[PDB]
């Protein structure tokens, strides 16, 4: 609450549920290997 | 020697760990053999 | 098999088998199994 950013974007979709750990900055499977993946030094928050 | 890492020559860290993780042993390599190189120098500017 | 091998018995029985031998596309394990987790201290998985 005590900065100002630049280019916020937000990203929505829905999951198994198991897969609630590949949605970190560096995984393993199908979902972080063939649907959505996050670059290594990433800035930003995951809300699930 | 290896400072802390799991391995020395730096071919196989590389050659072992992915980028993410590599950058820990890499940088432990780095300021040991940063250290060793420091000490060698003034040593010589000493016998200079 | 060894996986789908219905013989994980217990503590005081983990008998280990030495396999050997063998040539296996590690990819299998990280992506032709979906074996839940897979913490693999050590060497990661892309180059296993
Ligand atoms: C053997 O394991 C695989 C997953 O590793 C599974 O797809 C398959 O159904 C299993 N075989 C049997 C007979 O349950």
């Given at each position: 609450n005590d900065l100002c950013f630049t280019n916020v974007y937000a990203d929505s979709f829905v999951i198994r549920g198991d897969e609630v750990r590949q949605i970190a900055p560096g995984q393993t499977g199908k979902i972080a290997d063939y649907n959505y993946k996050l670059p290594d030094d990433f800035t930003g928050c995951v809300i699930a | 020697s290896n400072f802390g890492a799991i391995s020395s020559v730096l071919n196989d860290i590389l050659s072992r760990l992915d980028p993410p993780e590599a950058e820990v042993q890499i940088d432990r390599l780095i300021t040991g053999r940063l250290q060793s190189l420091q000490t060698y120098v003034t040593q010589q500017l000493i016998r200079a | 098999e060894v996986f789908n091998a219905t013989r994980f018995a217990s503590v005081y029985a983990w008998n280990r088998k030495r396999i050997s031998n063998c040539v296996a596309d590690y990819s299998v394990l990280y992506?032709?199994?979906?074996?839940?987790?897979f913490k693999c201290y050590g060497v990661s998985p892309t180059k296993l």
């Open positions: - | - | 992506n032709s199994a979906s074996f839940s987790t």
